């Protein structure tokens, strides 16, 4: 050598963290505010590297951390314009509903005419209002935080969003097909712009979302540890579809100058308890396939038992169905199911109006009702379980479905990504000796 | 199925000498000392790192699957029942001496 030369545009990269922007594919405002997302490319590049191997871990990945922060901000932005339901916590004289699940009653509140009081009737669910003492109730969450109703215009439909890296940066992914959660993968391809991700919210059974191929991938921070949750990923889509047969009726209630509060109004039609149904034979064998995968990872006999208990948001499967927030048992699926027809498993459950989602300090939110029955299908593509163990157990290693921090939902779909900085400057030895 | 053992089960050493205790176990190991009727306290975590508030002369070392805890120049109040703490597994300790 003995003479230096500089090369521009060489394949060198090193780990780094950087902000990423959104992108949407293809009239009505969205909670995700996708109208600001730039249009997606017609055909994203999928360059593939052949003789390079890289290792990365999703648990320490910063991509999931950034997503969790911005999603919170979007909901904060969404609820800012529309009004907040502060003037509704009074002595709610509620006795019963003519049509222990639905309560019909009225609250004595004033709109104008300061020295005047006029009542208005509204319908609330039993769990929405807590007893104050007999025949006296009160709004649940207004001794801890202010309730704000979701703006009627926006919609909760989750559409795919691409977190697309900036210029001068690359995102590395590998499809190892039985890709382990952590460790080196020898088939890495550089994609400039990620693919569609659906911001879905759930607590027990991950829904919609992408699937795997010829595998049942089990991912967790550490198998031995108990606190760490286990994320199962299924290659088979077990469809789950259900409706709310009851018929609502929208109604507007004045609360102040230019402020409107939409209540449940009047119930029309016979009452029919909501429920969700799931195929029996399809689900029964689905857990058996998962059980076989868990048998080798643990070597011991496995039994599924229902969740121990806790808050209603973690002990019951939850999701969004056309602006209605559900909370269902899912107790018949994971009870006494030791694994070593047209029957369908029905899962009766009820609805909640005020939801404490995005668990944080002093923050609530109210979901306005929607008129008419709602139907929504969905795909089950992963179970979130928390292993119950004290050791010294002849096999009998019990697994209990549960939940956890919200980021665990998205880690199952971001499990192969790494945003990396690119350094195209290179110095090598050569006998040039520039003239 | 993390496992551990306590070979000696009985420890005796005169004051002012060097005495050691070992707990062969897999995974992370933590050492605690328990007075009579009171709660334990943490000496070291991850096998080597020292907790704040534990007086000097208490340190630990790791060699493969075995963990070293070195105790030297004994003075009063140091008598304790030392045990190794795996995630959800604790084995009985041993009163040091007096």
């Amino acid at each position, epitope marked *: 050598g003995l003479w230096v030369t500089v090369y521009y545009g060489v394949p060198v990269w090193r780990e780094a963290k950087t902000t990423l922007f959104c992108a949407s594919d293809a009239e009505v405002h969205n909670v995700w505010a996708t109208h600001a997302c730039v249009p997606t490319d017609p055909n994203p590049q999928e360059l593939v590297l052949e003789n390079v191997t890289e290792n990365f871990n999703m648990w320490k990945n910063d991509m999931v951390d950034q997503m969790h922060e911005d999603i919170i901000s979007l909901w904060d932005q969404s609820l800012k314009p529309c009004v907040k339901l502060t003037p509704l916590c009074v002595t709610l004289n509620c006795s019963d509903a003519k049509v222990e699940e639905i309560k019909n009653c009225s609250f004595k509140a004033t709109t104008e005419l300061r020295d005047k009081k006029r009542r208005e009737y509204a319908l609330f669910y039993r769990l929405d209002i807590v007893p104050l003492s007999n025949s006296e109730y009160r709004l649940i969450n207004c001794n801890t935080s202010v309730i704000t109703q979701i703006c009627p215009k926006v919609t909760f439909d989750p559409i795919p969003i691409h977190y697309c890296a900036p210029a001068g940066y690359a995102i590395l992914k590998c499809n190892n097909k039985t890709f382990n959660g952590t460790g080196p993968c020898n088939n890495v391809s550089t994609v400039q712009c990620t693919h569609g991700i659906k911001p879905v919210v759930s607590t027990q059974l991950l829904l919609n979302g992408s699937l795997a191929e010829e595998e049942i991938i089990i991912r967790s921070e550490n198998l031995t540890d108990n606190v760490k949750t286990i994320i199962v990923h299924l290659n088979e889509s077990v469809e789950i579809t259900c409706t709310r047969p009851n018929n609502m009726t929208r109604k507007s209630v004045r609360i102040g100058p230019g402020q409107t509060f939409y209540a449940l109004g009047d119930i029309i039609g016979d009452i029919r308890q909501p429920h969700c149904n799931i195929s029996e034979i399809k689900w029964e064998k689905t857990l058996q396939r998962v059980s076989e995968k868990l048998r080798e990872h643990f070597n011991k006999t496995i039994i599924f038992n229902q969740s121990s208990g806790g808050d209603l*948001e973690i002990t019951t499967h939850s999701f969004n169905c056309g602006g209605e927030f559900f909370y269902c048992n899912t107790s018949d699926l994971f009870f006494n199911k030791t694994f070593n027809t047209n029957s369908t498993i029905t899962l009766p459950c009820r609805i909640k109006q005020i939801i404490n989602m995005w668990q944080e300090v002093g923050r609530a939110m109210y979901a306005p009702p929607i008129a008419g029955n709602i139907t929504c299908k969905s795909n089950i593509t992963g179970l979130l379980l928390t292993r119950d163990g004290g050791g010294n157990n002849s096999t009998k290693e019990t697994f*209990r479905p549960g939940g956890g921090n919200m980021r665990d939902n998205w880690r199952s779909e971001l499990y192969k990504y790494k945003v990396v900085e690119v350094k195209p400057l290179g110095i090598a030895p050569t006998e040039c000796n520039r003239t | 199925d993390i496992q551990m053992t306590q070979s000696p089960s009985s420890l005796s050493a005169s004051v002012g000498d060097t005495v050691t205790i070992t707990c062969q176990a897999n995974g992370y190991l*933590n050492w605690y000392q328990q007075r009579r009727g*009171k709660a*334990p306290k943490l000496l070291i975590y991850d096998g080597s790192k020292l907790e704040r508030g534990v007086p000097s002369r208490f340190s630990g070392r790791r060699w493969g699957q075995e963990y070293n805890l070195t105790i030297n120049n004994l003075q009063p109040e140091d008598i304790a029942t030392y045990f190794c703490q795996v995630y959800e597994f604790v084995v009985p300790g041993t009163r040091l001496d007096l």
Partner: nanobody, 121 residues
């Protein structure tokens, strides 16, 4: 990490129920897990379970499953979180002292412990 005071001593006849309360004020309770330990006379420590302060999700061994129930009741302010531990059935070997611990990080280490609550039968 100012204090982790526990309830007082109590005695209950067989078949009764015993309540033990653990309170934490100093540190942020919504960030670190809480574990419960047991120690019968003339024996080493024993594990009862852990409860997540964020969402009240318990986790207990097989032997204590169906008997112990861990509950958390935050005060009006997000401080002085109260952690409870209730059991239904009693046995002659349940005579022990129960402590209140705290998990710091991925490393299962505990630096703050409660005084203790001896319970007999």
């Amino acid at each position: 990490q100012v204090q982790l005071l526990q309830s007082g001593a109590a005695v209950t006849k067989p078949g009764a129920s015993v309540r033990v309360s653990c309170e934490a004020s100093g540190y942020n309770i919504r960030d670190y897990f809480i574990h419960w330990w047991r120690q019968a006379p003339g024996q080493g420590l024993q594990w009862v379970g852990w409860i997540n302060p964020k969402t009240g999700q318990p986790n207990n061994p097989r032997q204590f499953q169906g008997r112990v129930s861990l509950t958390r009741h935050a005060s009006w302010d997000f401080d002085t979180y109260s952690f409870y531990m209730d059991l239904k059935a009693l046995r002659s070997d349940d005579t022990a002292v129960y402590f209140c611990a705290r998990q710091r990080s991925d490393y299962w280490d505990f630096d703050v412990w409660g005084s203790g609550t001896q319970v007999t039968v």
